[PDB]
């Protein structure tokens, strides 16, 4: 057997590591398969992509098209259906068809040997006629073949019967193909539309309690539902809900001794009431949980629970399971650490003596979890635990649960954080908040939406409680607009943490990305109603934002997306397209200063003529303007961070 | 299972075609292995190559080390020994001794749990005594331990202890490695230094006869072989020897029609007299090639035959395989083209009825000429016949005769090209002739020295009979010299046609690469020994090319390349290394102006500090200069095209 067939197809994309993981989708989501075609010889090639669904059912006729004159690099767009292993295929074939008529074109007009080419015709589309199911369709090529062998008729009019646009549309729907052969399968996991598209929000549900009862529970917390519904996010994101250790608590600001009434830290999980399957008892019971996830779907909303694989030294598992940690020659165990960041409220998880029981402890755990009607976690620091011990937990759970969506907030090298997307997590978290100017950006997301798109799906958290990055402490809230403009526009997945609306930005001090006073530390009330009342929340920019997306099917896909270029270091222009839906963004990105540009669309990427003029409605105000390939855009930061466009038809 | 070990080893390299085909090597030749590792947490790594032979012995201890902070990818350099399929496998590792200095560094000074940090040490330093073989290594690892326990000694004493340059030296021998994980084999094909590294000498031997028989035949085609030897070259190309069909014999200047005496293009293959496995009668007969191939074995020269699978319509297979051909309505057969070139005199072949018959029968002629010492074959158009056919041909006659070089003539698109060499062909012709500014040769061979020669090793010839590039023919003898000094030191593999030595750059017209009165159509008598004494041929030149090549075994490689910067266009730079020997050059590709320039030599890429200044010799004149970060060079057309450097050592 040889390698290569009889026509070469090679180098099928997408792939992740060689075929040994899947290339990922969701329902409805189109993505591009491409493949390196061509054959010996001048004659034409062709080539198709057959995707094959659960039950082995092909797809519809899907035809290749060369991408670049001169490259003999192949593509198509499919679109994922129902969620499952999907597998696709690349067939490339001989064209003779497309050889023929190519010849005849020219040897017809020429008067060389035509008896001859259009007998060469006749046999082409006779065997073409054979190989078509349909009735109607086959009397429409024997009706050409005999007109190409009428002696009676001129060489030109026997050839044009052959040509003619109803005999074109036979051939692209049920084209002769010579020398079929076939790339080996490649497979496609299709998970649920979640996985790619949501609007997520963050808060601590001990904030939000009352005058008698500070610390809040979960049925106080849950009058903060409606108004995160109504902003219109999908997601409520809750950092851990269990009990909190007492030895070595942190106190406020991040300070080594916990007072008095000193909450700690929620990511210190475990005391004597319990680990990571319990229930912090200032927060209520296992039922008002229930009571909180029932809620919450009724809004529209999923919970998301934080999963940290990592114990206070008050866990239960300190003294029932001693070989879960590393201990040092005098019996202790080291806190972890992140340097210069110290974690002394906690202990990591060690993984060599006892990895099967971690797994089956670790399953046990969300699946219980998962019996609450929690679907999603956020997987706290998984670049601290071994790639090969998530990569075990996440397909245990999707292999009885395909529905459960698992975040990674690897926070970490690009190595890692590609190879944590690749062994299963669903959606990962970025560099998003490290990328705020226009060449920053630009990068980014053409990294994010090209290649990486096959295995990861990026979450853009404009911030959370661990950043708040120098942009925003500079910017005030005009940073916070623009942040949410882009990270809602740019991704079909991105999140705030509680607080982002009312512009909270003040550091811990110059230099850090902390904030001041921070929530990890202490209960922090917020007076919600008064910020509304005086209009000191960016609240209905957000809710706006988040129905543009329900609105506008381009805004919940990742891989259609292209940047347009402008005169203006500040301003940043780009398109995202889905059928016949196109938005089109304009931001400035200076927070202190007005910025005019002229903004320049490549119109051809849009679908239309470079001459062309079509209108736009700015979905942030109602107004329309009129775009063609060079327009005119001032844009005043407090008034205007951006314009958010759906081009009319 | 899972997909990912224990400590992550990711995507080895080279690879090609996913692991389905093997990477090259030659005997002698080092390239470097690479792969993307790290682990979970802070702690520190280490990873290995492990290179298996042919009966699977294993090679020494070859440590990678990171190959730029950051990245966590990691390289080592490997060399290749025998002949035959070997295999390698990266081994990655947990570097526990490098994380404990890295802690202790720190942790000891600062007066932080220093007893214990020092006992964690000794308790290191036996686990890595106990894996040590050697008896005198074992003991000074012990020694380190017992002073690192000592209690009555200061605690910056007893660390400094374990930290001696004779301890470090037996760690990097024997290193203690936790978690132990392996990539997955990938394969090596290693074959024989001729198939890298090489100078041929295209010729035709009809056209070296004498005034009595002016059609040369082997015994007087021999008389050449001693010359050609002298310009030292090791492969002679020979056109096909074949008899030559009459049927639509071309004539002279590729005109249609070949008039009483005219010899015809000796690719028009075969007549009455014989077909691929017999010699044309003008030729002379098997045993006169025998001798041909017996004289060129003593002055060091192997042959290489032209394999051109097409037939004159005279050829026997016209009417004995009938169903080897493609016949049109009328039976007739059409002409091969390759528009808008046409070659009326012969016939393609077609390969979808037979490909049993034709593979065997392809592998039986060459086997014939396989028998009578031909070990190379330079295979004509070979992307006119399919990739797959060649694949099996290869396989077939490697299987039993792996010495056998193929050259694949592959005058074609990119990907085409690559392809052939991933099937099977030990070398390819390039796209060499038609990269003559600095940009196009800096470019081109950066990608053939990089990730290219893992699967594709080039012969670089200046000229062929049908390619002579326009540089040629407006530079004249200066131009001749540029492009020998450029083919001959940036590939292992060069070559020249016949007449490139006596500067011959006539164009059949203007626009044209083809030569003036073609020696593809006639005979064409050169007065060698009259050139010789007129001083008008480059023969001296080359000669002294090909032993600085000899000389030098940086030049026998083509990985090892880098570019250094000059202030001007026209003059260009480069290094060459292998062990000690270092070879930089610096070319003035303008052949009418004398060109002045600084060349600014990377000096950490020859192995050397910004400040030094180095001795080198020109190999081309013998003169000796002394050369540093910044050096002026003067070079003239016609005097000097270059400076040809070895560093003296
Ligand atoms: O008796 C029979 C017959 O015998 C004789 O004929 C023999 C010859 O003696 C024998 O040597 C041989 O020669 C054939 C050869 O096998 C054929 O393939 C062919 O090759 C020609 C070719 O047809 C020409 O067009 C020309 O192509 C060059 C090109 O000029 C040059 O620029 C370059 O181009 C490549 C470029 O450098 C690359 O970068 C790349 O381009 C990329 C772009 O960069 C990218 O941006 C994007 O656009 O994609 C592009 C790729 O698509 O690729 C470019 C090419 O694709 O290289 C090409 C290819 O080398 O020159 C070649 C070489 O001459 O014809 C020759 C000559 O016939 O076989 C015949 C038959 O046996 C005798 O001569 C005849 O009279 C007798 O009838
Ligand atoms: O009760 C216990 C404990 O609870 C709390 O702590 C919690 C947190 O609440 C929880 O969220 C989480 O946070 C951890 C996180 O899991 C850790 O990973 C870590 O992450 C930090 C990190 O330590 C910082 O260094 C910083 O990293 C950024 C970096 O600043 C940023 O610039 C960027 O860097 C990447 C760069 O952008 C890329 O281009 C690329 O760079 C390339 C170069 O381009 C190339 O040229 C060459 O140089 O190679 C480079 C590659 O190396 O990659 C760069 C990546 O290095 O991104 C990094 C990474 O995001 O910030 C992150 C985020 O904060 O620490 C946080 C915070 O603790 O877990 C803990 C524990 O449960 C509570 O706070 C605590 O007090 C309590 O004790
Ligand atoms: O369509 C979105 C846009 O709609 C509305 O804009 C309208 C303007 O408010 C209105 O005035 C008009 O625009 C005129 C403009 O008034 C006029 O002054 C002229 O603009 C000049 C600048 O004055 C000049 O400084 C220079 O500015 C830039 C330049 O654009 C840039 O390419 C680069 O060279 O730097 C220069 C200096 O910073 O040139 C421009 C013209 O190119 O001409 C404008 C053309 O119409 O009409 C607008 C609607 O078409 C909204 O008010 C606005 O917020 C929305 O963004
Ligand atoms: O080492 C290899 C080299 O050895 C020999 O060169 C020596 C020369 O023979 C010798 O004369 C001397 O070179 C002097 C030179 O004589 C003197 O004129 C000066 O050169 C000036 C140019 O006159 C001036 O036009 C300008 O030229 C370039 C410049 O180099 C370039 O960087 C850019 O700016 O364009 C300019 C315009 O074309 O500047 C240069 C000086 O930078 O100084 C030279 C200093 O050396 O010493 C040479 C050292 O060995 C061989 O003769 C020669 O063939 C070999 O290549």
Redesign the interface.
Known sequence: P?????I?V??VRP?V?????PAKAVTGESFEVSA?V?????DAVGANVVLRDPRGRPGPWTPMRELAP???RWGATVTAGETGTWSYTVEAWGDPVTTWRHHARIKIPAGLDTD?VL??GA?LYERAAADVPGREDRRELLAAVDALRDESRPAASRLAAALTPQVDAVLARHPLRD?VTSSDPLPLLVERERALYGAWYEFFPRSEGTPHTPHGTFRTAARRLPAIAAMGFDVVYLPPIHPIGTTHRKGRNNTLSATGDDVGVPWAIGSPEGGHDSIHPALGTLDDFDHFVTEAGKLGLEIALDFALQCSPDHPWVHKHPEWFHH???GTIAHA???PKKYQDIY?IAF?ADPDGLATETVRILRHWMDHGVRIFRVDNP??????FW??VIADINGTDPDVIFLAAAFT????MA?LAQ?GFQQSYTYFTWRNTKQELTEYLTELSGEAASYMRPNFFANTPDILHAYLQHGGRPAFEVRAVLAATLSPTWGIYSGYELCENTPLREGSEEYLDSEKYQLKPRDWTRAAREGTTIAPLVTRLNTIRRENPALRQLRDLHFHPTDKEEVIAYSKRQGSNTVLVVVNLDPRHTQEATVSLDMPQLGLDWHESVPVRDELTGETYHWGRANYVRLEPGRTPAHVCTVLR
């Open positions: 040889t390698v290569v067939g009889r070469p090679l180098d792939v590591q060689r075929g040994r993981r390196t061509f054959r010996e010889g001048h001169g490259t003999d001859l007998e060469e046999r020398l040092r020659p005098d650490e992140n340097p990591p060599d670049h601290t635990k071994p790639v090969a990569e075990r090298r690009p190595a890692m190879t062994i």
